[model samples]
Target: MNYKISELMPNLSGTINAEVVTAYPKKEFSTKGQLKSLFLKDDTGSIRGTLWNELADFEVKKGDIAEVSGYVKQGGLEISVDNIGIIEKSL
Candidate 1:
């Protein structure tokens, strides 16, 4: 299931594909973290991606292409990449 960023933004389910456009490390909760982002574009528009931990091992960087399988949730969009809900990353 491929969804454009513009369309996915409003959907709370399904998968989406896009390109990483930004990468940064975030420090919080007494720990340091990585924040990988993407620029997903569709006929409508584009959106930024925020990929965490294990997911980062796949190495989503600026211009890195990827297919993310997850959905939107409160406390920010949520994804159990490969089902290991560390609330971050994939497996």
Candidate 2:
């Protein structure tokens, strides 16, 4: 199900089609591996999410709207982009 950021909370998983308000640079850590963080915001609200590994290399940039399937976790409402998440840029 596609969820608006206003309706998201810890322990839920779903898809969200939101604009990339801010697409941070990808980071590679010894243990955390590779990932990129982006701030997502829909007409409802906003949240922080991450794209890991290959998804981290996605060409998404700030102001682009993308569709993402991810899991919302308890650690500060962070979303972990699933292996097959982050489909593509949208209209």
Candidate 3:
């Protein structure tokens, strides 16, 4: 199910198609390994998301619209491009 950013919460897992308001530089976490941080927003709102490992291979610059699948946890929302999640340019 695709949801707006403002409709997300810690208990739900689904897909969100939004524009990349800000794409932060990638980071390497010793525990979680390497990942890239970016913020996405729809007409509703925005939230932070992480693109992990090989998922970070793409160039997601600011203003790019992305379709992501994942869930929000205690830390925040996560979209693993390798596993059950994916991050791609949305048409």
Candidate 4:
């Protein structure tokens, strides 16, 4: 199911279609722990998404449209993206 950021909740899981509002520099927490964090926003709201390890190669810049799938985490909605998600020019 597709959801707006405002519609997301801690228990439900699905896709979120939004634009990349910010993409933070990638970080490494351990030998195996690396991630790129970003914020995605629609007209309604915004949420954070993290790309893990190898998945961090999927480049997305500010204003790019993204269709990501995952669930809400402690801080906010997050997507445990692999190379499986899609990013496109802003629409």
For model 1, which pairs clash?
Answer: 55-90
**lDDT of candidate 2 over 1-91, digit per residue (tens):** 6789888888888888888889898898874578899988889988888888878887887777778788998666878888433445544
lDDT for model 3: 0.70
How are the candidates ranked when ordered by TM-score, highest leading? 2, 4, 3, 1
Better candidate number, 2 or 3, judged by lDDT: 2
TM-scores for all candidates: the values are 0.52, 0.83, 0.75, 0.82
C-alpha lDDT values of all predictions: 0.48, 0.80, 0.70, 0.76
Q: What is the clash count for each candidate, in the order shown?
A: 1, 0, 0, 0
List model 4 lDDT by residue over 4-51, tens digit each: 888887766678878888989998877477888888888899788888
Cα misplacement distance, residue 37 of candidate 3 (Å):
0.4
Off by over 4 Å in 2: 83-91
> Which numbered prediction scores highest in TM-score against the true structure?
2
Q: Which stretches of candidate 4 lie over 4 Å from their true place?
A: 82-84
The residue-by-residue lDDT of candidate 1 on 1-91, one tens digit each, is 5666555544466565555445555323325554444444335554544456545454444554556666655434333333212222323
When summed lDDT is taken over every stretch of 10 residues in candidate 1, the lowest stretch is 82-91
Superposed Cα deviation of residue 55, candidate 4 (Å): 1.4
The TM-score that candidate 3 achieves is 0.75
Q: State in Å the error of residue 12, model 3.
A: 1.5
